[PDB]
Design an enzyme around this catalytic site. Structure first.
Site, mmCIF file in Angstrom:
data_model
loop_
_atom_site.group_PDB
_atom_site.id
_atom_site.type_symbol
_atom_site.label_atom_id
_atom_site.label_comp_id
_atom_site.label_asym_id
_atom_site.label_seq_id
_atom_site.Cartn_x
_atom_site.Cartn_y
_atom_site.Cartn_z
ATOM 1 N N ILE A 284 1.043 5.316 5.141
ATOM 2 C CA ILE A 284 0.631 6.710 5.008
ATOM 3 C C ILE A 284 -0.889 6.820 5.184
ATOM 4 O O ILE A 284 -1.650 6.150 4.492
ATOM 5 C CB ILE A 284 1.081 7.298 3.647
ATOM 6 N N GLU B 279 8.510 2.539 1.539
ATOM 7 C CA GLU B 279 9.113 1.314 1.006
ATOM 8 C C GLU B 279 10.640 1.366 1.111
ATOM 9 O O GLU B 279 11.272 0.349 1.409
ATOM 10 C CB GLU B 279 8.671 1.020 -0.437
ATOM 11 N N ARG C 105 11.604 0.519 4.569
ATOM 12 C CA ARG C 105 11.471 -0.920 4.807
ATOM 13 C C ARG C 105 12.588 -1.775 4.220
ATOM 14 O O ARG C 105 12.912 -2.830 4.774
ATOM 15 C CB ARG C 105 10.150 -1.427 4.242
HETATM 16 O O1 LIG Z 1 -1.368 -2.904 -1.394
HETATM 17 C C1 LIG Z 1 -0.876 -2.054 -0.674
HETATM 18 C C2 LIG Z 1 -0.144 -1.023 -1.197
HETATM 19 C C3 LIG Z 1 0.427 -0.058 -0.403
HETATM 20 N N1 LIG Z 1 0.270 -0.213 0.874
HETATM 21 C C4 LIG Z 1 0.778 0.718 1.794
HETATM 22 O O2 LIG Z 1 -0.132 1.785 1.877
HETATM 23 C C5 LIG Z 1 0.528 2.728 2.701
HETATM 24 C C6 LIG Z 1 -0.334 3.974 2.674
HETATM 25 O O3 LIG Z 1 -1.737 3.647 2.553
HETATM 26 P P1 LIG Z 1 -2.701 2.978 3.672
HETATM 27 O O4 LIG Z 1 -1.896 2.058 4.519
HETATM 28 O O5 LIG Z 1 -3.507 4.020 4.342
HETATM 29 O O6 LIG Z 1 -3.756 2.020 2.969
HETATM 30 P P2 LIG Z 1 -4.004 0.546 3.503
HETATM 31 O O7 LIG Z 1 -2.844 -0.151 2.935
HETATM 32 O O8 LIG Z 1 -4.190 0.504 4.992
HETATM 33 O O9 LIG Z 1 -5.343 0.105 2.727
HETATM 34 P P3 LIG Z 1 -6.103 -1.308 2.854
HETATM 35 O O10 LIG Z 1 -5.505 -2.253 1.864
HETATM 36 O O11 LIG Z 1 -5.820 -1.688 4.279
HETATM 37 O O12 LIG Z 1 -7.534 -1.097 2.538
HETATM 38 C C7 LIG Z 1 1.968 2.715 2.182
HETATM 39 O O13 LIG Z 1 3.035 2.855 3.154
HETATM 40 C C8 LIG Z 1 2.067 1.372 1.435
HETATM 41 O O14 LIG Z 1 2.998 0.407 1.877
HETATM 42 C C9 LIG Z 1 -0.478 -1.275 1.400
HETATM 43 O O15 LIG Z 1 -0.643 -1.426 2.614
HETATM 44 N N2 LIG Z 1 -1.026 -2.172 0.610
#
Ligand SMILES: O=c1ccn([C@@H]2O[C@H](COP(=O)(O)OP(=O)(O)OP(=O)(O)O)[C@@H](O)[C@H]2O)c(=O)[nH]1
Ligand SMILES: *[C@@H]1O[C@H](CO)[C@@H](O)[C@H](O)[C@H]1NC(C)=O
Length: 246
Positions: free
Chosen positions: A71, A160, A163
């Protein structure tokens, strides 16, 4: 675009929405019969829009990166909201451009930062269809602390669940009563990248993981996944993050 309405929602209509979300993600290959998400997509085609309606019929539109199911942000009325991270800033170049104003949330989208902002780990945040209805309502009016919690609910109940079949079923079980996620649910969320990678590495390894993945099962027991014959691989996981993005 894909749509979900909380008014009249039940396990079946939710299942249809999660099927739609999975089917909206492009892929050219399956690996052990699981759709493999693309390495990249250029331009606006990178982002899927989810139209979500709360019980009263109010709506937000959520932008999802189709390569990774992450997201990026959402539109509520005339205001767009994006995560404070480069991928979301890039996404803001393509979606919700017609918004009267754009607010960058004071956190990135990862679980760690969201949980810090929310003031609680998602172990303690009930999820379900009522929680999703609440999350949508919360996101309609800006409150960054409240939004962090709503986003933890939203992410788990959409991305999730797309997935992992186990997680869509967890939410279906919570159609009319919220409950905190099972430890297994948390385990799967945390392992998606690792599982996605090992399933891909198994292709040239005779179906064997290069490195085992440790999960918690439905009884609360910690188990090692070592190869593609495991039920997590044959039944549960529905989408693979491309190793090019790991
Ligand atoms: O630790 C997590 C937790 C959640 N998510 C995922 O975040 C999505 C929405 O959030 P984002 O994808 O925009 O955040 P990101 O994970 O890219 O952030 P960084 O760690 O890269 O800085 C959701 O679909 C969820 O799966 C992660 O990628 N990492
Ligand atoms: C593969 O995983 C299955 C299912 O968990 C397990 O029974 C078996 O011991 C593993 N086999 C190999 C060759 O690693």
């Amino acid at each position: 675009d894909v749509s979900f309405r909380l008014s009249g929602a039940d396990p079946s209509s939710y299942g249809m929405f999660i099927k739609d979300l999975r089917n909206a993600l492009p892929h050219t290959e399956k690996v052990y019969n699981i759709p493999l998400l693309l390495p990249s997509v250029s331009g606006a085609g990178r982002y899927l829009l989810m139209h979500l309606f709360n019980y009263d019929g109010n709506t937000i539109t959520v932008a999802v990166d189709v390569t990774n199911v992450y997201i990026m942000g959402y539109l509520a009325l005339t205001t767009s909201y994006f995560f404070n991270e480069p991928a979301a800033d890039l996404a803001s170049q393509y979606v919700f451009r017609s918004a009267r104003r754009k607010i960058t949330l004071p956190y990135s989208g990862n679980y760690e930062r969201l949980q810090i902002a929310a003031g609680k780990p998602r172990e303690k945040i009930p999820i379900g269809l009522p929680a999703l209805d609440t999350a949508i309502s919360t996101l309609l009016h800006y409150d960054s602390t409240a939004a962090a919690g709503a986003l933890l609910v939203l992410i788990q109940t959409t991305a999730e669940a797309a997935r992992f079949k186990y997680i869509e079923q967890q939410i279906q079980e919570r159609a009319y009563r919220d409950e905190v996620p099972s430890s297994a649910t948390i385990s799967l969320e945390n392992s998606w990248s690792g599982l996605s990678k090992q399933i891909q590495l198994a292709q040239g390894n005779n179906g064997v993981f290069r490195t085992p993945t440790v999960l918690v099962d439905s009884k609360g027991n910690r188990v090692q996944i070592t190869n593609v014959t495991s039920n997590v691989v044959t039944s549960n996981i529905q989408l693979l993050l491309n190793t090019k993005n790991i």
